[PDB]
């Protein structure tokens, strides 16, 4: 009547043979999870890293959260160490239900936190430790350097030790070098009684992996990668604030809406309790959001496989409809991977080749295009090595690799293959195509990966 809970999405328990490999345990759980955005995985029981951090020695400043339905937050933003944080949010946790912390039922404190956020006379708030970098504070998993002890080196090569997922040769940033702004590292999260995470979706729509290493549970939400525009629809309605552009990609506006609401209008939806030694994966363009039981500490990182490579692309595509701006170009992560062919997996190859078909096709009709618009004029220019913020498009913001159009009257400025008539006020023979690749480079790239793929 005043919450009801969303249904549970599904739980895998993977024999150590199916867990050994997590690009196979994942790419055989897509047909099921894909339809839920979340699911939940308990590894093998005797599977069980140790933790490696330190309580006193480690010091983070957590941002504060009103605890709002529907007030826009930022996405990423007093000093405390894991002890004296760990103190407070013991004592916040206990005084608020006048209970010990292990006696307060998940289910009460689900029902609490969604009257909590709806309720204007209340002003509760709390600290999160959110988006800690692990290159600062260190990884809750093991990690070469410390003298390790054999049980903690066990996991150092661990398939889901979340510092190795995204290096595995199985993963499309294994070969990619450009920092990212921290997609290939992960991030740690320590949580207190009702710290939130807003309704969001990863960067590039990419996977996340997520792992409780100890402490009280995480509820999520969770919304299929099939509902995601439907879910945008409802919060456009009730929360429209929230869809203002930004600008830049430090200035993403966030909140919390209770599941309810999602289900009410037909979005699905479903939860889970997530424990200490619990994964949760989120699937591309699966919208989630929840909140912490108590104290706690969470890792996760971005993960992008070949089954992500063609979502990747579309994404890119969304975000130059919406002018928002990328962490990396799409078609200069293809690039570098097509320069490496010869030491790709061999699967991974196989989907490159395939996008790469794609973009060289779509590449060519935007040439033709610009050329019809009377750019004559034409020079190489290597896109990579441009800062990001010297090669975004001028209307849509996308990062520019393949190609973009300059003008002599505006220097500097740039606009990609689509928005060349918002460049400047001058006539289209004094423009110039920029390109990284002439028709006749791409193709022998994308020879290399089909060799390589067999
Ligand atoms: C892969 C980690 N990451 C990247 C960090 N930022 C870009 C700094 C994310 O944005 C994860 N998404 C936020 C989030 C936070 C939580 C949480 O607070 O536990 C759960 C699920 N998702
Ligand atoms: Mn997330
Ligand atoms: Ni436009
Ligand atoms: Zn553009």
Redesign the pocket.
């Known amino acids: 009547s005043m919450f009801l809970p969303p249904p549970e999405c599904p739980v895998f328990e993977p024999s150590w043979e199916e867990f050994a490999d997590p690009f196979a345990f994942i790419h055989k759980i897509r047909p099921i999870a894909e339809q839920t955005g979340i699911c939940k995985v308990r590894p093998p029981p005797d599977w069980q890293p140790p933790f490696a951090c330190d309580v006193d020695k480690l010091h983070f400043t957590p941002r504060i959260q009103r605890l709002n339905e529907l007030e826009a937050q930022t996405?990423?933003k007093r000093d405390y160490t894991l002890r004296t944080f760990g103190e407070m949010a013991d004592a916040f946790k206990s005084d608020y239900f006048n209970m010990p912390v292990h006696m307060v039922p998940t289910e009460l404190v689900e029902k609490e936190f969604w009257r909590l956020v709806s309720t204007i006379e209340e002003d509760v708030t709390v600290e999160?430790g959110?988006?800690i970098?692990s290159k600062e504070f260190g990884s809750g998993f093991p990690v070469r350097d410390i003298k390790l002890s054999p049980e903690e080196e066990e996991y150092l090569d661990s398939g889901w030790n979340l510092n190795n997922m995204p290096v595995m040769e199985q993963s499309v940033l294994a070969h990619i070098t450009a920092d990212i702004?921290?997609?290939k590292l992960?991030?740690l999260?320590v949580?207190m009684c009702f710290?939130?995470?807003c309704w969001?979706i990863?960067?590039h729509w990419?996977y996340?992996?997520?792992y409780l290493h100890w402490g009280e549970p995480?509820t999520?939400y969770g919304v299929p990668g099939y509902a995601a525009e439907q879910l945008e629809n409802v919060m456009k309605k009730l929360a429209p604030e929230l869809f203002v552009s930004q600008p830049d990609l430090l200035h993403q506006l966030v909140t919390i809406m209770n599941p309810n609401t999602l289900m009410t209008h037909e979005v699905p939806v479903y939860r889970t309790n997530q424990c200490a030694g619990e994964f949760?994966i989120?699937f591309p363009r699966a919208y989630?959001?929840?909140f912490?039981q108590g104290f706690n500490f969470?890792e996760?990182?971005?993960?992008c496989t070949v089954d992500w490579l063609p979502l990747g692309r579309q994404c890119v595509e969304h975000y130059r409809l919406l002018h928002r701006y990328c962490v990396f170009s799409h078609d200069e992560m293809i690039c570098k991977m097509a320069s490496k062919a010869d030491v790709l997996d061999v699967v991974v190859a196989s989907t490159v080749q395939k996008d790469m078909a794609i973009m060289i096709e779509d590449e060519k009709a935007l040439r033709e295009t610009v050329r019809k618009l009377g750019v004559i004029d034409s020079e190489r220019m290597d896109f990579e090595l441009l800062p990001d913020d010297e090669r975004q498009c001028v209307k849509c913001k996308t990062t520019c690799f393949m190609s973009a159009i300059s003008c002599s009257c505006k220097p500097g400025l740039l606009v990609c293959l689509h928005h060349v008539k918002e460049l400047c006020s001058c006539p289209p023979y004094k423009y110039k195509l920029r390109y990284r690749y002439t028709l006749d480079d791409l193709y022998p790239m994308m020879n290399a990966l089909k060799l390589r793929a067999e």
């Open positions: 996405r990423v999160y959110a988006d970098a702004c921290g997609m992960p991030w999260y949580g710290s939130s995470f969001h990863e960067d990419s996340s992996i997520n995480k999520w949760v989120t989630h959001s929840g912490n969470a996760a990182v971005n993960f």
